[PDB]
């Protein structure tokens, strides 16, 4: 399945443009995919524990928000 390859090179380009990056080595795209997957694993792992300890099968936005704040990366807009 390997849906990490669905994070295409242009999508990684635009994230770098918003990051203010002018020239991108062609080796960046594989390194960025590894970075993203390592991050996104950690958040979902934490979120699923809030879901299960609330005795739910559905992971909720506040499960994600608590996982993010637990990681020090507080996200506003989805809930208090």
């Amino acid at each position: 399945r390997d849906n990490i390859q669905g994070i295409t090179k242009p999508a990684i380009r635009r994230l770098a443009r918003r990051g203010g990056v002018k020239r991108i080595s062609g080796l960046i795209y594989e390194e960025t995919r590894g970075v993203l997957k390592v991050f996104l694993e950690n958040v979902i792992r934490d979120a699923v524990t809030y879901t299960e300890h609330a005795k739910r099968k559905t992971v909720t936005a506040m499960d994600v928000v608590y996982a993010l704040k637990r990681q020090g990366r507080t996200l506003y807009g989805f809930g208090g």
């Binding site: 950690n42 792992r45 934490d46 524990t49 809030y50 300890h53 609330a54 637990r70 990681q71």
Partner: peptide, 15 residues
């Protein structure tokens, strides 16, 4: 091995 091991498990007690 992963810091959030504690904070994950602590929710089992709390809620």
């Amino acid at each position: 091995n992963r810091k959030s091991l504690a904070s994950q498990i602590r929710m089992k007690n709390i809620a």
